[PDB]
Amino acid sequence: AKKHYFIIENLCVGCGLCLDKCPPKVNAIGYKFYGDVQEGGFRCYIDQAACISCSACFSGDECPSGALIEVLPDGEVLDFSYTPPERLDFDLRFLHRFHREA
Amino acid sequence: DAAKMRRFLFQRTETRSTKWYQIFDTEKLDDEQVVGGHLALLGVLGFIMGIYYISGIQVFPWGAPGFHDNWFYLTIKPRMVSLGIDTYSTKTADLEAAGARLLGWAAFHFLVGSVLIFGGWRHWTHNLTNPFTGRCGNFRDFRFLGKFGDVVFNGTSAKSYKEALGPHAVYMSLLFLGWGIVMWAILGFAPIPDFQTINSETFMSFVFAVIFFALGIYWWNNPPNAAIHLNDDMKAAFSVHLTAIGYINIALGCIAFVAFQQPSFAPYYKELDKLVFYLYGEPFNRVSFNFVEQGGKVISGAKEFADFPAYAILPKSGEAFGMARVVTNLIVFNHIICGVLYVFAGVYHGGQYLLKIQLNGMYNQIKSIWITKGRDQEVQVKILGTVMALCFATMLSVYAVIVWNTICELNIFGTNITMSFYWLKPLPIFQWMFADPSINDWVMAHVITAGSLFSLIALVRIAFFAHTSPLWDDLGLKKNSYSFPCLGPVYGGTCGVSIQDQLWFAMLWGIKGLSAVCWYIDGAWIASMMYGVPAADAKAWDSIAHLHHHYTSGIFYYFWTETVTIFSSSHLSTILMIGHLVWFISFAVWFEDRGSRLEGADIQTRTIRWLGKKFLNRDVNFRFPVLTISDSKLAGTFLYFGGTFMLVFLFLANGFYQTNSPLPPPV
Amino acid sequence: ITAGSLFSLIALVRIAFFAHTSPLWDDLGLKKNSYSFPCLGPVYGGTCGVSIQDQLWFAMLWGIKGLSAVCWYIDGAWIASMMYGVPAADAKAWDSIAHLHHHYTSGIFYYFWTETVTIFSSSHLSTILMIGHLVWFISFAVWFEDRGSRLEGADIQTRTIRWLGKKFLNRDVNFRFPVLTISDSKLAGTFLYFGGTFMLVFLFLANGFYQTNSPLPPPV
Amino acid sequence: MQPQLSRPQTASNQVRKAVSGPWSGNAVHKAEKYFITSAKRDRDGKLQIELVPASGRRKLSPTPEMIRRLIDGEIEIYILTTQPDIAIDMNKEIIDMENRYVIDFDKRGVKWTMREIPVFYHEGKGLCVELHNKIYTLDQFFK
Amino acid sequence: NGKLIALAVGGAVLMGALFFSVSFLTGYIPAPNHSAILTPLRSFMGWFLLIFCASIIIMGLGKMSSAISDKWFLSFPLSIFVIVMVMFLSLRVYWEKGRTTTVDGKYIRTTAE
Amino acid sequence: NGKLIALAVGGAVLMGALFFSVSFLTGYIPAPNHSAILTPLRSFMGWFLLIFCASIIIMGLGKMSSAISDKWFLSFPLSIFVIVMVMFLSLRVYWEKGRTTTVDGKYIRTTAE
Amino acid sequence: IRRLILAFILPPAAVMNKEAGTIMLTGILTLWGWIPGVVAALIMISKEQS
Ligand code: G2O
Ligand code: G2O
Ligand SMILES: CCCCCCCCCCCC(=O)OC[C@H]1O[C@H](OC(C)(C)CCC/C(C)=C/C=C/C(C)=C/C=C/C(C)=C/C=C/C=C(C)/C=C\C=C(C)\C=C\c2c(C)ccc(C)c2C)[C@H](O)[C@@H](O)[C@@H]1O
Ligand SMILES: CCCCCCCCCCCCCCCC(=O)OC[C@H](COP(=O)(O)OC[C@@H](O)CO)OC(=O)CCCCCCCCCCCCCCC
Ligand code: SF4
Ligand code: SF4
Ligand code: SF4
Ligand SMILES: [Ca+2]
Ligand SMILES: [Ca+2]
C-alpha cells in the first residue's frame, strides 16, 4: 500500500519494539549489527519489499527515538502519531500570596 | 515454519497488551463501576470479618470445643475486648457469652455484606432499579435518601468528584454518628468525654460526626478545586487518594504503636500477657513411633506429657511469648507496610496518569499547581539532586555510625566499645518520644530518614521522569509505555527506566527502611550489626551506654536469636522455607537473563516435541512461554517483596523476647 | 551432585554450541557476534543474557548450589532434608528411624543456626560474615534489570554535583559519574555474588566440624 | 537548560532553551525537526524545497524566516536519503559505505539501510548539506 | 488426547513400582510397628502428590490468567472467600478437631500452669 | 582545585566540631575511666576514617583500572606480594606481638588443658 | 518583623520567594527537628538583603 513507514538508522536504538508489532508472516523489520550492541550496534531496518504498510510499527507509538517516520503518500514525513502542540511556557508566581516572586 | 513460532513469542511482548492483571484498570471503569466494585469488596470484607469472628469462637455456646488461636483473630481480639464483644475471661460461663456475641456479629456481617455485595453488583451492571417499586434510580442526578436528601443536598446529586467530596464527608459523618449510636445502644458505652475508656471513642465519634457533617456542608456549598483530578479521576484522583491513604495508614500504624502500650490500653493489649494461647501449627504433644490409640491412658509409646491427649497443641504463656507486643507489632507493621505500599502505588499510578497526559500533550495543559511546579525540567533535576544528596548524607552518616559500632563491638583493628557511638543519643528535647533513649533510637530515626529518602528518589523519578528525563532529554529518547523494561544495551544499557521499574526499585529500597521497623518494634538494636553476641564487647552495650532495657540482638545476630523460636515450631519453620523459596526465585526474573530463558525454552520446546516423537507419538505443538522483562519484573517484585515479608512476619509473630533486664558487662 | 552438574552443564553446553547462533536465533534474524554482549533489547519480549559470558555467569550461579552441596556434605550437614536436629516435630528423630551411626550438624535451613554459634563467638568470623553478606547483596545492584535506571540516576548525580559545585562552589565540575555497562554490570555482579557466598562457605568450612558420632536418641 | 545543571560537555546545539521544552512538542527533538520531503523542478531551473515538520501538519518552504530560525538554533532540517528527489546514488553510496563495517548476517540489513543527513545554512550558498567530505547544496547539486 | 494421561498415569505407576523395587534392594530397618511393603508406598504417594500438586498449581493458576476477565467481577473474590471459609472450618473439623484440654478436661487458658 | 581539599577537610572538621558539640548536649554517662573531651572525638575519628578509607579504596581501585595495562606485568604481583608481606609481618610486630603464652610464660600446645 | 516571626514559626511560610524546589528543602529541614528549617529560612532570607 501507500504511506511507507521506514526506519532511520540514525535515531534507532535497535530496541525492536517496532519489530514486536510487525506481523510474523512479513519479516519487514530486521536487525543489522556491524559491531557490538553495547554501542548501539544493533540498528533495525524495514525491508520495504516485504513491508505491507500495516501501520502496526508506527501506530503502536513505541519508537522512543523517533526513528519510525511513516512518510505520507504525497510527501509528508511524520515522526510520532500525535505531537504535543509546541506551547510557549513560563513559571506563574503570584505577587504576595502563595508565592511572592522576588 | 519459523513464523508460526514467531507469533508465539509475539504474544508476551511488552507492547500495549491486555495484561490480565489490568482487567479492572480504571481506564475501562466509570464512576458507578468503581462504586459497585468498592461496595462488593466491602461486602467481601464483611464476609471475611465474619469469618475472623467465627475463628474467634472458643466455646461454641451450643456446646463443643472451640477454635484454636490464630493471628487473623488475635490481631483483632484486643479490639473486640475493647468493644465488649470478646472477653479476657478465665471461665467458660463468661466465654460462652463472648462466643454467642461473636457468632451473632459474624451472622450480622454476613447479612450486611451480602446486601452490600448485591448493591455493588447492581452498580457494577448499571441496574439501579428498585425491584419493590419497579422504578430506576439515576446515578448522575439522584435524591440521596429522601427528605434528608432534600434538606441537605437539595436534589442535585454531585456531578463531579470535587463536588462529591462534600456529600462523601456527610456520608462519613453519617458513618461516625451511626457508629456512635451503635456503641451507645448495642455495646453499652455511653459517650463520656473521659479519654481513658472506650466511652471516649463514642464521644469522639459524635464529635467527628458533627465535624464531618459541617465540613461536608461547607464542601457541598463550596467545593474545592484540585481541578485536574476531576477529569481522569480514575487514575489522577485515585492515585492521589492512594498516596494520601498510604500516609494515613503509616500514621495509623504509629498511633497504634503508641496507644497499645499506654496504660489506658492495658485491659486490651497488656493483659494479653496474662493469657495462654493455643496457636494453630505450634508445637503439639508429640508421641513415640508405636502409638496404638486406645485413649484414656497411653499404653505403648508414652507421649511427651500425660495430659493433652494424642496430638494436642501445647500451651504457650503470654509472658514469655510477648503476645501483647506481638499483636501490637503485627498490627503496627501491617499498617505501616500497607501505608508504604499505598504511597508507592499512589506515586506509580499517578506517574501512569502523568505519562498518559505527557504523551497526548495534556501535561502542558495542566493549570493546577501540582504539575505547573514540576513542568520545569530543572526544578525536577534540582529536587531529585537535593533528595539524593540528603539521602547520601544521612545514609552514609548512619551506616558509618553502625559500622563503627560493630567494629568497636568486635574490637576489629584493636578498637573498644568505649570508642563506639554509645554517647550519640537523641537530644533531651527529643528524648520524650522514646523509652530508654539510646544510640539505638538515634540510629532508628536516621535509618528511617535514609530509607525514606532512598525510596523517595525512585518516587521522585516516577513523578518527574515518567515520559522524559534530563538524561533521556539529552539523548534522543522518550519514555512512552510506563511498563517498558528497556530500550536495549545502547548507551551501555537502558534497563528499568520506566515508572513501573522505578516503582519496583522504590519497593526494594523501602524494604530496608521498612524492615528496620520490624527490628525496632521487636527491640533489635539496629545501632550495630552484632549485639548481644559474645565475641569481644557486644554484651557491654547495656553497661557502656547505660541501657534500661535489653534488646534482642544486633542486625545480623537478630537472625540467630529469636530464630530459636521460629525453628522451635513447625509452622514458622515451613513459613521460613516457603518465604526463602519464593524470594530467591525472584533472581530467575530480575537477573538480566530473560533472553537466556527464551533461548532455553525454545530448546526445551524442541526437546519435548522431539521427545514426543522418538518415544511418544502425535504432534507436541505446545511451547513453553517465558515471562518478558515487564512480566519478569512484576513477578520478581512480587516474589521478592512477599518472600522477605513472609519472614518479617516470622520475626514479628515468633515472640517479642525483648526483656527489661540489661545484662552486666562481660568484664 | 548429578542435578547441579547437569544444571550447570546446561549453560556449559549452550556456551559450547550456541556461541554464535542457536536454533531459536536461526529462526529469528539474529546472530551472536560479541561473546560478551548482554542482550538485543526488549525485542521479541527480551534477549537478556544470551552471550557465552552471560551463560558462563549462569553456569557459575547454578554450580553455586551443587558446590554448596559439597560444602555441606563435607561438613556433615544432612542435605537430605531442610530441617535436622531442630526440635519442631521429628527432625531430632532421624538418627533413630534411619539407624544412623553419626549425628550430622543440622538440616539445610537449620545449618545456618547451628555451626553459626561459633562464627558469632569470634570477631573475625563475624566480620567475614558481614562483609560476605554485604558483597553478596551488592551484586543485586548490577544483576537486576536496572542498568538504565542507574545510568539515569548517575546523570542526575553528575548534574547535582556540578550544580552544587558551580553556584555554591566555583569552576566547572567536568567529572561525570560512570555506570558499569550491562556486560560490566553482569561481570561485577557475578563476582560479587560468587565471592559473597564463598567467603561464608569458608565460614561453614573454617569454624569447626561438629559432626559427632552420637546418634541423638529420639525424644519419644 | 542551565549550563550548571547539564552534562558537562554540552554544546548550545544540544542545550535546549524553553526550560520546559520536552513537553512542548515531541520530547525526542530539542529543536523543531523539519524534513526535506520534495524538491521538484518547475518552469525555470530553480527547485522548490518543501519543509514538512516531523509533526506532519504543515508544508513549508526554506524562506528567509525559517532560515533565520535555523541559524538561531531553533529548528533542524533533515533530508531522509531515501528521498526520491535525490541526485546522488544514495542506495549505492549507503550500501558501499556499510560494506566497510557491516557483516550481513541477515543478508538484507545493508540493502534497507536508510538514514537522515542534516542540512545547514551558510549564507553565500543556500541550504547546503555536507556529505562524504564534500559540501553539496540543495540549490542544484544535491537536489 | 487419552494417550498422554495413559502415559502420565503410566509413568507415575511405573516409577512407583520402581520405588517399590528399590525399597527391597536397600537393607533398612523400618519403624517399630510398620510393614516393609506400605512404608515406601506412602513415601512415593507423598513424593508423587507433591510433584502433582506443583504441576496442577502451575497447570491451573497459569490457565486462570487465560480466563480471568471483567466477567469475573463476581465469584472470583467469592471463590477466594469460600476458600478462606472452607480452610477455616477444616482447621476445626479436620485439623485440631477440638480445643486443647488435659485428659481431665480443664482449659488452661491463663497463667495457671 | 584546592577548594575541594579545603572542603573535604573543611567538611570533616565541621563533623569534628559537630559530633564533639552534640556530645555535650545529648547527656550521657561516659565509660567508667574516661574523659568526655576525647570519647566523642575517638568515635568521630573512627567514623571519618571509615568513610575516608572507603572513598580512597574506591578512588584507588578506579584509578588502577584506567592506569593498569600490559606494562604492569611486574609490580602488580609484586605490590600484592609486598602488601601480603606487610600484613603478615604486622601480624607479628604490631597485632598480637607474640604467640600466646600463660602469665608465667609457659607454652601450652597440646590437649593438656 | 512579620517575616522573621513566620520563619521562626513556619519556616516555609516566610520563604515563598525562592523556588518550587527550595521550598521543599526548607519544609523537610523543618520536618527534621525544627532548627534546620529555621536556619535555612534565615539564611535565604538574609541572602537577598545582605
Ligand atoms: C527454584 C530454583 C530454580 C529452578 C527450579 C529453575 C528451573 C529452571 N531454570 Mg532457572 N534460575 C533460578 C532458579 C531456578 N530455576 C535462579 C535463581 C536464576 C538466576 C541466576 C535462574 C536463571 C535461569 C536462567 C538464566 C535460565 C534458567 C533456566 C531454567 C530452566 C532449565 C530447564 C531445565 O533443564 O530443567 C530444569 C528444571 C527443573 C529441575 C525444575 C524442577 C523443579 C524442581 C523440583 C524444583 C521445583 C521448583 C520450585 C522450587 C518449586 C516451585 C513450584 C511451585 C508450584 C511452588 C528451568 C526451568 C533456563 C531456561 O529456562 O532454559 C534452559 C535458563 O535459560 N534459569
Ligand atoms: C550497600 C548497598 C547499596 C548502596 C550503598 C546503594 C547506593 C546507591 N544506589 Mg543502589 N542498589 C542496591 C544497593 C545499594 N545501592 C541494590 C541491592 C540494588 C538492586 C535492587 C540497587 C539498585 C539501584 C538502582 C536501580 C539505582 C541505584 C542507585 C543508587 C544510588 C542512589 C543515589 C543515592 O541515594 O546516594 C546514596 C548513596 C550512598 C549513601 C552510598 C553510601 C553508602 C555507604 C555508606 C557506603 C558504602 C558502600 C559500600 C557498601 C561499601 C563500599 C566501600 C568499599 C571500601 C568496599 C546510590 C549510589 C540509583 C542510582 O544510580 O542513582 C539514583 C539507581 O538508579 N541502586
Ligand atoms: C563514601 C562512598 C563513596 C563516595 C565517592 C563517590 C565516587 C563514585 C564515582 C565512581 C568513579 C571513581 O570513584 O573512580 C574513578 C575516579 O575516582 C576519583 O575521581 C573522583 C570520583 C572525582 C574523586 C571521588 C569524590 C570524593 C573525593 C570522595 C569522598 C567524598 C565523601 C563521601 C564526603 C561526603 C560526606 C557526607 C555527604 C556527610 C555530609 C552530611 C552534612 C551534615 C551532617 C548535615 C546535617 C547536620 C545539621 C542539619 C544539624 C544536625 C542536628 C543537631 C546538631 C541537633 C538537633 C537536630 C534535630 C539536628 C538535625 C579519582 O580522583 C580518579 O583518579 C579516578 O579516575
Ligand atoms: C525436557 C526439557 C525440560 C522440560 C521441562 C523443563 C521445564 C519445567 C519447569 C517447571 C517448574 C519451573 C521451575 C520454576 C521456574 C522459576 O523458578 O523461574 C521463575 C519463572 C519464570 O520463568 P521463565 O518464564 O523465565 O522460564 C521458565 C520456563 O521454564 C518456562 O517459562 O516464573 C516466575 O517468574 C514465577 C512467578 C510467577 C508469578 C508469581 C508472582 C508472585 C505471586 C505471589 C507468590 C508470592 C506471594 C508474595 C510473596 C512475596
Ligand atoms: S521502535 Fe524505533 S528505536 Fe526501536 S528498533 Fe524500531 S525504529 Fe529503532
Ligand atoms: S507497516 Fe506493517 S509490514 Fe511494514 S514494517 Fe510496519 S508492521 Fe511491518
Ligand atoms: S539486559 Fe534485559 S532489561 Fe536490560 S537492556 Fe538488555 S534486554 Fe533490556
Ligand atoms: Ca518479634
Ligand atoms: Ca564445617
Explained architecture:
Chain C: Ca(2+) 1 binds at residues 75, 111, 115, 204, 207. Chain C: This is Photosystem P840 reaction center, large subunit. Chain C: Chlorophyll a 1 binds at residue 65. The structure is cut from a larger assembly and holds 1 copy of chain A (102 residues), 2 copies of chain B, 1 copy of chain D (143 residues), 2 copies of chain E (113 residues) and 1 copy of chain G (50 residues). Chain A is largely without helices or strands and 102 residues long. Chain A contains 2 helices and 2 strands. Chain A has helices spanning 17-21, 56-59; strands spanning 29-31, 44-46. A two-stranded antiparallel ribbon of chain A has the order 1-2. The radius of gyration of chain A is 20 Å and the shape is elongated. Chain B has 667 residues and is an all-alpha fold. Chain B is built from 21 helices and 2 strands. In chain B, helix 2 runs antiparallel to helix 5 and helix 10 (323-359) runs parallel beside helix 13. Chain B starts with 5 loop residues before the first helix and ends in a 14-residue tail after the last helix. Chain E contains 3 helices and no strands. The longest helix of chain E is centred in the middle third of the chain and has 28 residues, at 38-65. The N and C termini of chain E lie far apart (63 Å). Chain G is mainly alpha-helical and 50 residues long. Helix content of chain G is 66%, strand content 0%. Chain G contains 4 helices and no strands. Chain G is globular. At the A-B interface, helix 1 of A face loops of B. Bound molecules: Chlorophyll A ester (2 copies), ligand F39, 1,2-dipalmitoyl-phosphatidyl-glycerole, iron/sulfur cluster (SF4) (3 copies) and calcium ion (2 copies). One Chlorophyll A ester sits between chains B (581, 584-585, 587-588, 591, 593, 596-597, 600-601, 604) and C (10, 49, 58, 61).
